């Protein structure tokens, strides 16, 4: 009595006996190839923050650009597709003087994202005012009137009597989100050339600003004239530039801003909760896939394991292994 | 595949097949959590944290790779060991049916 075999050797590895030649094997791995990214099967995969917001970038949405507001769909899974997000309209920003470009990437790390419907503070009667709220032709609103970012209020002195230089003024930014949510407060400051600074604010020297929230302090000094070229903006010439920053207010805490002339006071504020699973990828998402792999894109789990470039991945994925593993499917080989 | 000398033992042949099938299914249905980015750590702002996160991913992938390799090695151990168990079970049947009048070589 006995057992038939293919009479051909195939080496496998065992736990206590080392390598053994057997009659047959089943390979357990493949090497994937690179292709486009896709929707993750079983999820709504977040690419753009507001896909219905047409002709808007993620940073446009994060700053509240006019015509770029609306609901941000929740998502348990998100794709980081811009290492350095850009704007595509509104008033010219000197982006790289702060961390502001990362704001939409910070937002996509949360599952739930929404812009507050209340103003966190009243801009017109803020310290150092009263102020009229500045608007710009670079930022056309729904009926094409002059507007501005919904997250901020351009504070311009309303009365010539108070149109003067000011000592640093402190404003408290309260927490207006729902308990459990993080609040991300967007603020900044406008600057211009020397004569336009005198006309707008009654002072043409550099202005200074600080923010402070949860023990995190920042400090900025403005620039008067000699600005870099306008970029990523509304395409309309402007003599001035704005600097924009964000501060994260955690666990229901109040933040503070100290400011002088040109302050962009916060208005609408981001409220975010939960956690979204994020990997790097590229748009557009084409079709669907079992798995999203940072190096291979969308892929489908044909076998339980894979060899090749290990990387961050999400979904129903094959597991990275070091060697092409083989399951034994036969008897011990003996030379015939 | 299993038999005597010619006739094939259907159940002994079949149960050897199922043993390899159970091992394949067991290895195919392992659940291992995946690795994604930190939601809070931003590029440029938190590069030092991101370097440690990359180190954590690299060490985790190596650990899981060794763990799955051992699982395959343990599966192959039981499969290769089962050949001797099947043969011994085939000899016990040729000794129970063939009475003591026969002698085993």
């Amino acid at each position, epitope marked *: 009595t006995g057992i038939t075999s293919s009479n051909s050797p195939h080496v496998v590895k065992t736990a206590t006996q080392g390598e053994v030649n057997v009659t047959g094997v*089943i*390979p357990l791995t*493949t090497t994937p190839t690179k292709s486009h990214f896709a929707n993750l*099967k079983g999820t709504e995969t977040r690419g753009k923050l507001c896909p219905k917001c047409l002709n808007c970038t993620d940073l446009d949405v994060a700053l509240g650009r006019p015509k770029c507001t609306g609901k941000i769909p929740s998502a348990r899974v998100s794709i980081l597709h811009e290492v350095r997000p850009v704007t595509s309209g509104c008033f010219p920003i000197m982006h790289d003087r702060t961390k502001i470009r990362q704001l939409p990437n910070l937002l996509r790390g949360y599952e739930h994202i929404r812009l507050s419907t209340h103003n966190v503070i009243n801009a017109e009667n803020a310290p150092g005012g009263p102020y009229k709220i500045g608007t710009s032709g670079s930022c056309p609103n729904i009926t094409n009137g002059n507007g501005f970012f919904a997250t901020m209020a351009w504070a311009v002195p309303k009365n010539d009597k108070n149109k003067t230089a000011t000592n640093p003024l402190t404003i408290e930014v309260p927490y207006i989100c729902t308990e459990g949510e993080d609040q991300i407060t967007v603020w900044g400051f406008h600057s211009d050339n020397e004569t336009q600074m005198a006309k707008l604010y009654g002072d043409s020297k550099p202005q200074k600003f600080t923010s402070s929230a949860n023990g995190v302090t920042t400090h900025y000094v403005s620039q008067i004239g000699g600005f870099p070229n306008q970029t990523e903006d509304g395409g309309l010439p402007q003599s001035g530039r704005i600097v924009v920053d964000y501060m994260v207010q955690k666990s229901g805490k109040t933040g503070t801003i100290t400011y002088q002339r040109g302050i962009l006071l916060p208005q609408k504020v981001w409220c975010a909760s939960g956690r979204s699973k994020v990997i790097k990828g590229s748009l557009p998402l084409i079709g*669907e*896939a*079992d798995c999203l792999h940072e190096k291979y894109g969308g892929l*489908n*789990k*044909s*076998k*339980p394991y894979y060899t090749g470039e290990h990387a961050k991945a999400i979904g*129903n994925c094959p597991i990275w292994v070091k060697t092409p593993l083989k399951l034994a499917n036969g008897t011990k080989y003996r030379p015939p | 595949w299993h038999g005597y000398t010619v006739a094939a033992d259907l159940k002994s042949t079949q149960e050897a097949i199922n043993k390899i*099938t159970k091992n*394949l*299914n067991s290895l*195919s*249905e392992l659940e291992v959590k995946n690795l994604q980015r930190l939601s809070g750590a931003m590029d440029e702002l938190h590069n030092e944290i991101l370097e440690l996160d990359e180190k954590v991913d690299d060490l985790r992938a190596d650990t899981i790779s060794s763990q799955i390799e051992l699982a395959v090695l343990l599966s192959n151990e039981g499969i290769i060991n089962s050949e001797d168990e099947h043969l011994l079970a085939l000899e016990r049947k040729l000794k129970k049916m063939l009475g003591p009048s026969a002698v085993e070589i």
Partner: nanobody
Amino acid sequence: EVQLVESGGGLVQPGGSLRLSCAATGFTLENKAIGWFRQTPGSEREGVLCISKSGSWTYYTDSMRGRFTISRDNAENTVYLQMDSLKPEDTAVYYCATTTAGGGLCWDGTTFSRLASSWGQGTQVTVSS
């Protein structure tokens, strides 16, 4: 008593399209992968396209990507192979196969064909003017 039954084959012109169906009796296709194969007379059976228990696709040969698509309907208990832009060389008997082994994954053509515990009787596709 379990059985797969292919249908939809027949004569079609080059550049034409044809939709084959793989219906199951005596068992359900849920949680199983279903792979399509084809065979030219005198040649070994070759893999075409498989759909996993999750509904995702695994192509068994590179050439057929694009032209061949696949879908499954758990209510209809049926898998469909959609063939477009057919060439004369696509003439063959087309088979579907399934199994409970391998975690409902598609594997590759060689391994899945060996894993298959059920094969349909095949349907003839003939591509000619």
